[PDB]
Design a protein around this nucleic acid. Structure first.
Lengths: 220, 220
RNA sequence: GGCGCGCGCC
RNA sequence: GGCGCGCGCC
RNA sequence: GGCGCGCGCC
RNA sequence: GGCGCGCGCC
RNA sequence: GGCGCGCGCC
RNA sequence: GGCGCGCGCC
RNA sequence: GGCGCGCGCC
RNA sequence: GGCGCGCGCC
């Protein structure tokens, strides 16, 4: 069967307007016109909604402070690539050699959903259910394991502990501003590498200091 | 008539579960339990989708580079407050004195949409149309006038030109990295105030330098 | 948009 | 032959 | 009319 | 560079 | 979570 | 009496 | 078992 | 502070 059919089968949906599906699979490098860009823009918001709606229904904790870290991972390039793999998107994409990467597979994943949405006559309910039918389980699992984007302090430690079997040091340099709105400046150190970071709390300051130190190291 | 009815009338929708609507209107300051937080989280993604879907259908230019600045304004606190005013949200919100502001009116606006969505049995199509019936025109107008969040360079100029009838100066300090991936460092100046900014293009560098200079000025 | 330039990738 | 990133001139 | 900023198209 | 849209200052 | 502290707002 | 921001101790 | 980081609850 | 979940190093 033709390639579009193969994907429609993996998708469990058949397009009325095949050009829509093909456009979602088309990178600008392969065609200056009718490529996935606009569908990606729409797909981004669409899928974001699908994910959040599911997250808010199945997350054990309904507090935003808890929902946010989960959502960050659930709408991340890493996770989208995980879901796309089930569809083997890579072999369907029309693109020049040497240009494909995970950002692209992610873009196409999003565009594809925008295409289905449009092809269905902008039926958000139908498209959402189609989405869940394919990925609800993968999403619930991630929510169950509480997967999240590792934070900077955690990332820094893993780095320094591997390359030196040592942990970075954080120290308060200064505190400014009104007592109910203090500004904290903290330094992160490893070996002779040093970086500063400011925040509204010591925790936040350290996070930023860690972020910078990671860059600094990565550069040297 | 009761307050919930007044709002349902302005909304053109009547809730089956009034507690849902009331919760969307309830700030944590008024009640530690059953306040709008989770609905705001869901409403944010929902409304974002409503806006983007409309933008992608009615924007004259379908390129992302063009869509993005419009979307930034269309999903901004400023615009949401504009749409909320039509509903007079402020008088329906349950909150303690001295805490309400535009971020809150924005949160409630979002929560309300999440509430309607849930109350309708998670019917995204119905809710979307309800949304458009009330705000499609306001959105199309904004898209027609091409409203966008003023950028830093523009903001800086307006500042310096008002307070000094003068324009800031930008100058290239240095350029680093591979020729196909240069790093630009630029300085923005006004009077003796000076700030630096880096970017992948001179334009971007200046933008960041302008961003910082605005802060610096605002502080002094 | 036109005329060019440096760099990189196929 | 085709793309990409940046820069300059009109 | 001038100066300048942003964006679109050519 | 040109033209267009938006805006600031004169 | 408990016991406190500085500050701010009603 | 009620909230908020930050910090400390267990 | 130890040290440390993040998050949740109490 | 305790307990829980995740992880890094020993």
């Amino acid at each position: 069967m033709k390639m579009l059919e193969q994907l429609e089968k993996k998708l469990g949906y058949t397009f009325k307007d095949k050009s829509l599906l093909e456009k979602a699979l088309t990178h600008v490098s392969y065609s200056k016109k009718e490529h996935y860009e606009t569908l990606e823009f729409l797909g981004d918001a669409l899928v974001n909604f699908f994910i959040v709606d599911l997250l808010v229904q199945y997350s054990p904790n309904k507090r935003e402070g808890f929902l946010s870290p989960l959502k960050a991972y659930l709408i991340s390039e890493e996770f989208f690539n995980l879901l796309a793999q089930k569809l083997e998107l890579h072999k369907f994409i029309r693109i020049k050699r040497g240009k494909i990467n995970e950002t692209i597979i992610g873009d196409v994943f999003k565009a594809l959903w925008a295409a289905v949405y449009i092809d269905s006559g902008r039926d958000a309910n139908f498209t959402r259910e189609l989405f869940y039918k394919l990925f609800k389980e993968d999403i619930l699992s991630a929510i169950k394991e509480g997967r999240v984007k590792k934070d900077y302090k955690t990332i820094l430690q893993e780095i320094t502990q591997k390359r030196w079997k040592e942990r970075p040091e954080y120290r308060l340099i200064s505190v400014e501003g009104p007592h109910h709105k203090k500004k904290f400046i903290v330094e992160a150190k490893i070996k002779e590498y040093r970086t500063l970071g400011e925040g509204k709390s010591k925790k936040e300051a350290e996070q930023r200091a860690a972020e910078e130190l990671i860059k600094l190291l990565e550069e040297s």
